[PDB]
């Protein structure tokens, strides 16, 4: 089997020059944002006070059309927080600074990839963004700040033209993904390394991307535990660094010899 040191040596020799990355909410728990499925602390274990038929309903499009108030109540709790990127985000920026990042596919809606300096064309926000919004009736677009302003004032955002409910451009369950998700069609067959960080690989079609790389390509998981195909459909060149994501990234950085570059980047940015 391959080790983490083997992956670091492949990168250092530039045998791997074209890295695709898949991330989820586990990369932002070190920044103070809860994930969805962790025992005790995950969002799905902490929605009892909301007016929901079941927890998952708060992120489902048909329920949003039925009653959007629980979703906006929850959003009011994320807007004020001044979350910052952590070492995981800056490591992905360092990959770009070294010319190794092919594309970063994220499920997160916290915006921290952009804050850490990943350029828009290298980034696929596969489940959308709070940065923009769309009227659910007339489909007119609006900046995300308008929605933020209404929500923090305890109002459901309504369209100034038709009075329909205006929704942030996040992909709810049951909603189409953005067109740029289709970059995966070319990105994954030519990637020469896949990095998977902080995700349960439970949501589709995002999770199916893990099988789109070639069988000859290593898949490196940095996560608290084995998940998805890495758990039940493993491949011979899979590597798992099971533990905290910041500790795993710092270990990889040390094996790569990138400690000075990481420190310089974090200093500049913080």
């Amino acid at each position: 089997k391959l080790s983490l040191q083997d992956v670091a040596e492949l990168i250092r020799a530039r045998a791997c020059q074209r890295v695709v990355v898949m991330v989820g909410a586990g990369i932002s728990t070190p920044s103070g944002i809860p994930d969805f499925r962790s025992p005790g602390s995950g969002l799905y274990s902490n929605l009892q006070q909301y007016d929901l038929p079941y927890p998952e309903a708060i992120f489902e499009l048909p329920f949003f059309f039925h009653n959007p108030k629980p979703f906006f109540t929850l959003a009011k709790e994320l807007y004020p927080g001044n979350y910052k990127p952590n070492v995981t985000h800056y490591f992905l920026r360092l990959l770009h600074d070294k010319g190794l990042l092919l594309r970063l596919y994220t499920q997160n809606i916290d915006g921290l990839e952009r804050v850490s300096g990943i350029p828009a064309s290298k980034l696929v926000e596969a489940h959308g963004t709070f940065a923009s919004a769309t009227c659910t009736v007339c489909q007119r677009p609006f900046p995300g700040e308008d929605i933020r302003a209404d929500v923090m004032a305890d109002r459901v955002p309504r369209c100034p033209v038709c009075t329909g409910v205006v929704k942030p451009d996040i992909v709810f369950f049951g909603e189409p993904l953005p067109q740029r998700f289709l970059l995966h069609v070319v990105d994954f067959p030519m990637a020469d390394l896949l990095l998977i960080l902080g995700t349960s690989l439970e949501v589709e079609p995002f999770a199916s991307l893990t099988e789109a790389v070639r069988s000859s390509v290593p898949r490196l998981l940095i996560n608290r535990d084995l998940v998805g195909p890495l758990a039940w459909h493993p491949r011979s060149r899979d590597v798992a660094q099971l533990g905290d994501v910041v500790h795993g990234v710092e270990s990889l950085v040390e094996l790569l010899g990138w400690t000075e570059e990481m420190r310089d980047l974090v200093q500049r940015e913080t």
């Binding site: 909603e175 189409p176 439970e202």
Partner: peptide, 9 residues
């Protein structure tokens, strides 16, 4: 038609 919908599976 080519754009997929998000599911729990």
């Amino acid at each position: 038609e080519a754009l997929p919908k998000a599911t729990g599976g």
